[PDB]
Assembly symmetry: C5
Homo-oligomer: 149 residues x 5
Amino acid sequence: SDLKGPELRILIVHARWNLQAIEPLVKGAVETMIEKHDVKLENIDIESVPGSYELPQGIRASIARNTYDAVIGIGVLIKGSTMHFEYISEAVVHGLMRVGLDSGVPVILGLLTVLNEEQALYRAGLNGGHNHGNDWGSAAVEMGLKALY
Amino acid sequence: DLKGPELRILIVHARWNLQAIEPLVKGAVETMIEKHDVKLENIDIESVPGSYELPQGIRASIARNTYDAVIGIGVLIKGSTMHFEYISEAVVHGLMRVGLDSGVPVILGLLTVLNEEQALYRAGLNGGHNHGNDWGSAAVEMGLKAL
Amino acid sequence: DLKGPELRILIVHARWNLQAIEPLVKGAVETMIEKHDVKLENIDIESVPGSYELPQGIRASIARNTYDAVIGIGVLIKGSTMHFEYISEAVVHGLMRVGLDSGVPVILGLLTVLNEEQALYRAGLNGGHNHGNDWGSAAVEMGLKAL
Amino acid sequence: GPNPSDLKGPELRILIVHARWNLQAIEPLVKGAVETMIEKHDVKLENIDIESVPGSYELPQGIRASIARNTYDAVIGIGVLIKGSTMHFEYISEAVVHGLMRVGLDSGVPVILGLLTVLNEEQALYRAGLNGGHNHGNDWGSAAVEMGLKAL
Amino acid sequence: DLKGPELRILIVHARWNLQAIEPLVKGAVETMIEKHDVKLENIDIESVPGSYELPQGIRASIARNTYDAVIGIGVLIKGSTMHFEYISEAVVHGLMRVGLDSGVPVILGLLTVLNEEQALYRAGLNGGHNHGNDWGSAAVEMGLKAL
């Protein structure tokens, strides 16, 4: 991917629960968009919400106020002792998807739904894993461009 | 650190299983007033028979009055049949919908546990952490960010 | 202790497995009349072939007449195929929808059980508690709150 | 135990959309649906439209397109899904059932679920009335009629 | 027997796991051309990063141009987390929606397998049958019936 998007406006909305993993993901996304796709730091809006359940709601509210070419919803869900994990994981995933089709703005799913901390960190590039935030960054640019031209 | 003295919050809770509901509603209210400067007279508390009416009750309410954020509280416990499985999913997807359709933030105060003990623990009893507190702060934050 | 003598309630029940449906419909009606002062003339009872037509039947009816609350009653029992799993989800999500789209409360009177015995028990037979009673009371409350 | 009706609907227009995958089971069902509507409910052969699609995934899409062109009083979506080696079964079964349900509520036209979601071929045939089973197409036909009438 | 020389087909495929995507896209195209008389110049082929963008991509494309039928191709393989389970469902439900909202047929060219071998087999490799072929014929049929 040699796609450059210097006029793209990207929005990043991440939950704040479990930051040991969130930060590396958000960081990876931003760095990849800037260093590999020529996106301008000043054209990247980063916002946060309490948890993953608010990801769709927060993204929906934001794309109504400003104009973005692509959005990235980042969050981490870890299986617990109850059925909570099962039910909101599904609700959020179906939710983001909806906000995207309703608004016409691309929504990248930066949602990790893991069984334990270790799996989440590994996917954030720690302990020899690959940072998925990088992939989401590149995806956002591609969808942003294809959404225009 | 986030103060919201002009916010109007709505809390709708089911009435089924009150040993857990009360602590949750109370924690939510206390946290909003004591930590976020929300005014007691700006908090409306309503109830419905069960969790299945949560979406329907919240929808009806935000159509009559104007709220900045809403909290849906209820407790679901796995039983002998497949009821738990199906309505848990329906309610979670339903509250989520009302939130996106109306544009009003809907905090999910629904506990979907396997037994009574897990419910109480998450209500702050028996050495657990009261989630109603987290929901209170969340409602304030979403209320403010929504403008 | 909620009285609703001017309420108009609609009950739509599937006809599949009547050993359990009847007790439920009867419990619902009795409870509304004897404990909430609802008038027999004000309760409309309709039926559909099966649970899959519950949302469709309810939607059609609330388009012709005006009701304050509705109750969808039906019984689903796990069979040998995956049929149970799939239409149970569809119906629960579907009634939920008709309720939010129309603005009319829709009480879920749907039992999703593993066998006949579980269904009857929840119909108040063999020492169980009749859930139709709970649904009747719910219908009233939601009806009034909808004002 | 399913309780039927002795309802007559000679002015009803019924549409039947079936997938073609696995016809050993589809035919009996379609045939049962049709015969039952004609012989027991007085529906007129000319008032029954029968269309088909490649597979069950196109059932909602096909029905939607058709009820936009013509006017029907009730629709029946017929199809057969059998658990395979992958997760395909699980996912499209759910998608289709939710899908037909939607088309029915959006359009206001009754949609009968003639979808069999079985674990093997045997279970499908049995429910198609073969090998001592009960033909479900029959039940769907009566359902279509009833919903059609109540819809007025 | 079904020829559609005036049909305009759209193919949108994810780029993840190309060892399987190519055979499928190839089979789809060949079958439409060699068996249904579709004209190569009337087949638009586009791509997206992953399966999650499939609905989003298709939606954007059928808004710019007019197609008679669409095919969404992608491959999802169970992993170590719950990711597979959740997006598989989301994408299948999403493509379905785009189809019903737009009125344009959307063929499901999404494989949801447990391992690489299963995907390749269904791509016609190792003695399996290429499903891309079936999707191509399907697209043609739906395109025509849609008129």
